[PDB]
Amino acid sequence: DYVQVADGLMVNKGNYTLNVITKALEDTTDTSNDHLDNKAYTGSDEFLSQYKIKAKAKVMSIKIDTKNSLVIAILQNGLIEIFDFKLTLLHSFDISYDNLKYAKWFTENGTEYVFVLCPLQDDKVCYKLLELTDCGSGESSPIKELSSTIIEGFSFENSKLCYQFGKLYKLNQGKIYIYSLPHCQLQQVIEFPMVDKLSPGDDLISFQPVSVNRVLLTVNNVIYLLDLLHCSTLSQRELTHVVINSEKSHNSKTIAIGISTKNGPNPTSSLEIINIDVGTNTLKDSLGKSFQVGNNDSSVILKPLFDDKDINDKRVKCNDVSGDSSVPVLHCNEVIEKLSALQDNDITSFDDIFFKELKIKEEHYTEKDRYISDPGFLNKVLDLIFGKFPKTLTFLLTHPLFPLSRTRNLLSLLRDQPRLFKQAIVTCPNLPLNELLEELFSIRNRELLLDISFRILQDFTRDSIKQEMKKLSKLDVQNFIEFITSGSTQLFQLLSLVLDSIGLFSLEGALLENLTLYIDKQVEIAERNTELWNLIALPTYTMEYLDI
């Protein structure tokens, strides 16, 4: 359920700006910013800050300081604005609002008295909720969502100071209880391997899933249902997927606990205090084709053998449709034991490998359909005969007659026995067209030309033939035209393919006139035998005789 995995304060800006992200700093004085330059003034600094935000103006900036209140700064002009203290305990995570969207006087200690985005505007005292250890702000109808370690969930809306909903959510010590990408849920990660999505409108779990592996710095991206997560002691920022018109590619969120992983875009090099290197450069979560790439958070493969429909009085099976048998006696233990019975001292003989395989699979030794087989099992026995031991006459005849051979076929030109090579041309059911075109244009001038042109026509699309038969020289195609003119239907359309794929201008003249004369007489004989196939009263006076 991952995404494209690589890369081992105003929240909607990017580059070409001066500093739309001014943030606090660990083990430093208070705060800083950088460019790709805006001034770094003070928002009444020197306190116990843990994050820093702005009023989406960058000259009405602040230092969100742990003193129960905050003031404004002047990071562009020089003229400050006035303020007013509400509390005096811890306002280290202050988030100033837009023009009357979401603001309340909640500092750290259950005193969420509602107010506005001003220095003297007030509202009701909505401090009714208990001691909440995870208070976030979302835009359902702009709302403070409190998750309390008195454990209980509540959701108040700071649009009319109205408590929308609330229940008993038994949330433990979390890792990141971040609001969702469309904001409709709460993604709260458990410590090692889990991330549960809860319904953040009713305070209830909606899908409690496990995660892939160790990940600590996790936050929802600007996506549909996708999150990013950096490793704890790792610079690996992977992506997973559990904004929809023209989504984001960079500058989505900045919450990470890597090696100073501030201001995390896709190319996240030029940081705000860190000056680090960059990583992946993809977009957000797409619909459903990127999950074939990010096919993670499940790695639990076993050896899948063919089961059977369970025998609940199977003796009344009513005229089974086989020839003589009813069910093949499945022996997967003997399938595994045939590997030990084959990987032995039959280093040049077919007495302890070919007889072993044809005893484990009692067939006609060139035929399918008496299957019980696994592709990993066939690949491992093919590896054991590709080792110390093509001189077996049963095993490597009955298993290119198997539709799971898996790309160990490249040396089929590199070994040349006539009957095994022609059988691997006709019947081996996955073949590389590179080797097929090389065998086709490495001509031995025989009927195996017809047998290779047959398969290269009957399992590859014509343009995929053309693009990969551009990869030829010109002596090959000149001798191919010469051999066709010297001395059939599939090779005529193969000749059409080579003429389509050599290109437009870079040709010669004598070969072209020879091919012109040859195919002129070819169309004449085709026309005449098509004609052959489509080609497959009394007078007034007579004089006659009769018997005497």
Binding site: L504, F505, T530, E531, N534, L535
Partner: protein
């Protein structure tokens, strides 16, 4: 009408199409007629398009299409394709024009990204002209 009476078959004004309309994805040369042809194709001028392609001298057609700008060889070919689709006796004289447009402008309309989608009407016309060739082979046999 009766309740047991079946509904008869009626096409009405249904558009019957084929499966092949891919409409959706100093001097020393001659005295030619290509200024006439070019400002026939810049507008949609069927009258002087007819007076330029009732010229049927092969060298005139050849260097006319050679002097033609290759950005509008595709629309000259579209006009020729529609005219041989409609009038069937024009296919003799006018396909001399369409084979010369492909030979001379063999680079522009191989660099165009959708050849069949851009000159669908030629593909459909030639497919319906050459599809019945076994039938009249059997007929003349």
């Amino acid at each position: 009408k009766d309740l047991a009476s079946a509904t008869n078959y009626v096409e009405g004004n249904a558009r019957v199409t084929s499966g092949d309309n891919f409409k959706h994805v100093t001097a020393t040369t001659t005295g030619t007629v290509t200024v006439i042809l070019s400002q026939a194709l810049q507008s949609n001028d069927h009258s002087l398009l007819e007076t330029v392609l009732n010229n049927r001298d092969e060298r005139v057609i050849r260097d006319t299409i050679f002097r033609l700008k290759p950005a509008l060889a595709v629309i000259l070919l579209e006009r020729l394709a529609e005219r041989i689709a409609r009038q069937t006796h024009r296919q003799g004289p006018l396909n001399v024009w369409v084979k010369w447009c492909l030979i001379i402008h063999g680079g522009y309309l191989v660099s165009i990204p959708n050849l069949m989608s851009t000159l669908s009407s030629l593909h459909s016309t030639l497919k319906r002209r050459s599809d019945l060739l076994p039938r009249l082979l059997a007929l003349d046999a």
